């Protein structure tokens, strides 16, 4: 099949990425990096979530694979030994395909929308003053949050930001987000939930400002400020990313491998 | 239909209960506590509690309600003013019904096993030693627990003691179960991931002895101490709780309600 | 004495400084901005915070006095119905003072050094991109903190700030800063201690920059980026902040009023 | 001078105990396990901890020293490999001492009351029931806590069960201790304070039951239950431990060397 390779861009990587290209051309796999159907990420989770966003507008159409020059990675989940045997399964096909939730995020904005998708999660803050929101809950208002801002985290988000922030570990499989608060104020006067919320499905979240209206917003490893934003809303994608599969390397046991022992 | 109301006990209770039986005797409604397919429950969540372990072997012939004569209860959230028109709808029928998963708890013991059903959540602690237990996923071996316990919810649960040990509040849509860390030992020799971790259905959760294996183990209200316990297994139980619902009271709301302001 | 007082700027807390600036003028005080040995800041605790800076290079000739004309603050102790009594025992003098321990910040920059106090907190967060900064107690390497910021804690700031990351709650009498994360990364490669830190008097804690060396470091309300930042010193400053006490408001209960309930 | 020597009682630490007190015998040195005036704890922090109890009835006369012959520990700060150093230096003596505060737990029952010291901490935990005290600080009325329990720290007290209940980690020459909270029940209804709470010395903090009045008290490895206590009353001792030191081991170096790399 059509195939594309994006590398972290050190010296490992290039020529891992080299080898790889040279062991396709033995095969039917022709390098397409507009239309492939395969796309190898080779380097870190920051480099398969750029590669994410290269090709998010055919998700559909991509099955994608990580390896890891460096440390174990929750996306970049193979080993640079491993490439040779990656790239004869590859050729063969008849690999089983997995998918992850993703995450909507929908900015409305001035006097129209902008939305996006996240692997890992979309965090909102201030523009530099307080960061003060309304919560509002498939349109019942739920909370006001003053604090230093909000992330939601997709599944396989929940090991990034999302965890340091005390957010639950969620497997891939259940389709939902996860809201999680960074440092709320909480006293007679001012109230939050303080624990994380986990939402289905069909539930939409919505962020509404109070006095300011200039927001930090991130989606993964991107951070764009946005002026004159009136909402943020948040919600389960009906859009999913794909994954090859060669072997059962389970969600779990990759948690244990990066957060317990390897 | 046969109808039942088990009551907390106290004055206000008890006189709310013999007021719906009068009310109840208006129609064709029998009062049967022995094969009721309405079981109604006044007080709070804790008698809510003992109703559905009361009835835990007809779960899928009865719909529940609660009635808080105190404060709002998650389970118990209809008012004390709302008995009669509660009294007439449920007369009438042709009300909706609304599920919530269960927690199946698995008890290995000695030279046999032990089932139980929990509405809120299960936990594991120790018989006044050191608590040591290895945590199983899936057949692979996660981590070495070495704490004050460990506490496994379901979602309608994760308001309850997992909210209390910082876990995640989860809609009960979500067939899940969650589990969260009561004090665990972490230093240079002892790990654990700290996190909460939410599994969906069919994953197996499995607590193993490493030394003692007397356990103090909780299902709801209930508190046993078990003795040569093996093996202690969590899963997403294929039965559910029934409720009766007249109006809607959102799952978040609720929350709100709980602990946001009312 | 020599007095001046400092208001909010709505008109509550105008009005009621011109009033008690009447009250004042049928004793033996003079108002003077300049050298005041009595400050007043009548507001909340932001206006009481920017009282402290505006006469912190005279803050042993100085007794603070904080009026709440909004919710109790734990500055702003006093109410406003108490403004006439607060004139006459002020005018007669025979007041005890209670001091406070301050934070001293030391920023150490370019190819020379600037110092702060802080009376609730100093933190450190980045430019935009990720923080990573090596964290040396007393000359030895402690930690390698990579995340969003540290977070380094007056006595009288722990209810602040320090108090939403988490920071153990200090009596004032304790003479000790204490040293916050902000959602830190913990996996199999990076760690840091997780807990707060609290360090005594003549302890030093120092953070030094290891890639990026542009950081956002603010001084309680006051927020300044910082360039070519050589390293960031933090101790307990032999400098104090002084109240007026008229009467028996203990720390404990001002939090219980602030946290709890009144 | 007179010396005793307390082993965990393995093999490595009773042969390591045994060829010390073979070198102590080429010196001056008696062995006596009544009135020594050193006293070597070969094993881990438990044994330290049986050792400190074994003899505080002469704390001002007793300069302790650990051994630790597994991993490394807060008291058992030795290594096995220095003992002989550790033997000569102790002989000739000319060492100083280093003082850690300690925390006085009074225990008022029945129709009289019983004190203890803890060199790590004093917990209260409910007897089976629920746990429901009210917390009073100072004569004043702080919080009604209800949960799982409460645990009081010394200073090298908070690197223990205190950091796994999210307390604050306290530099030793602070003379305070450390109130954490264990599973606190928060809601509309109930409202505790949720932070680690530090008190200097000479202030009180006084549990009083509410309904049961049965509680399970631990004093570091001891754990006693209780039976008609009317009042539980913590406050930082006067009384002092003694610690021989031969080299600088920094507190914040055994801290990073314990829970972040060695
Ligand atoms: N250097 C390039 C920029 C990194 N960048 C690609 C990433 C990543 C990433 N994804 C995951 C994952 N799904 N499960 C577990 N591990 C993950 N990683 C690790 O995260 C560490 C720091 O990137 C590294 O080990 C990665 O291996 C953006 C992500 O930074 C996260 N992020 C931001 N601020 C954070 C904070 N304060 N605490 C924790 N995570 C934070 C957030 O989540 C973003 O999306
Ligand atoms: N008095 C009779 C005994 C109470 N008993 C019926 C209960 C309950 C209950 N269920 C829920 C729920 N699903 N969502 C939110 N609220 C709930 N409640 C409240 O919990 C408070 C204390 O029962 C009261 O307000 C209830 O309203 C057993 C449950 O105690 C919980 N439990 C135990 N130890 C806890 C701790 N340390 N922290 C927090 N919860 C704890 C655990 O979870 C059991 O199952
Ligand atoms: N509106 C003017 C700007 C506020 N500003 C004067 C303040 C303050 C303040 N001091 C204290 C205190 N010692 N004990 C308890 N209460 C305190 N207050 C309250 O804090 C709330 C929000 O100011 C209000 O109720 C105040 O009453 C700066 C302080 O924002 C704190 N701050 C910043 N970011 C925070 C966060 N994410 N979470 C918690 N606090 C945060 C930080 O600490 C600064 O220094
Ligand atoms: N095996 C004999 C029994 C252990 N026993 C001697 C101990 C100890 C101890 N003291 C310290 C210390 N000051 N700083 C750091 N490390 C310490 N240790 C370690 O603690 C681990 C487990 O003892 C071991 O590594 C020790 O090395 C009683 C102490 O268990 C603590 N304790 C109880 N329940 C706990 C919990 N849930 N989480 C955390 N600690 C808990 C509590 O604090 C007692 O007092």
């Known amino acids: 099949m059509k195939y594309m390779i994006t590398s972290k861009g050190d010296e490992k990587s290039d020529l891992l990425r080299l080898n790889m290209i040279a062991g396709f051309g033995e095969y039917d796999m022709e390098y397409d990096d507009v239309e492939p159907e395969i796309v190898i990420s080779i380097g870190g989770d920051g480099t398969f979530l750029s590669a994410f966003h290269q090709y998010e507008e055919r998700l559909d159409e991509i099955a994608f694979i990580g390896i890891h020059t460096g440390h174990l990675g929750f996306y970049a989940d193979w080993r640079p030994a491993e490439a040779d045997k990656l790239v004869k399964l590859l050729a063969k096909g008849e690999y089983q395909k997995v998918s992850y939730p993703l995450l909507k995020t929908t900015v409305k904005y001035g006097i129209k929308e902008a939305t996006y998708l996240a692997l890992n999660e979309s965090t909102v803050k201030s523009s530099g003053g ?106 389960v994608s009906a859009k999913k990313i794909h994954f090859a599969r060669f072997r059962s390397f389970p969600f779990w046991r990759r948690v244990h491998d990066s957060f317990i022992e390897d």
Chains 1, 2, 3, 4 share one sequence.
């Open 130 to 235: 307080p960061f003060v929101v309304d919560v509002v809950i498939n349109d019942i208002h739920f909370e006001r949050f003053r604090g230093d801002g909000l992330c939601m985290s997709t599944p396989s988000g929940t090991t990034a930001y999302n965890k340091s922030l005390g957010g639950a570990l969620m497997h891939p499989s259940i389709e939902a987000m996860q809201l999680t608060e960074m440092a709320s104020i909480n006293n007679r006067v001012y109230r939050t939930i303080g624990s994380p919320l986990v939402f289905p499905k069909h539930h939409v979240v919505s962020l509404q400002p109070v006095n300011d209206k200039d927001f930090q917003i991130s989606v993964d490893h991107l951070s764009i400020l946005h002026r004159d934003v009136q909402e943020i809303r948040y919600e």
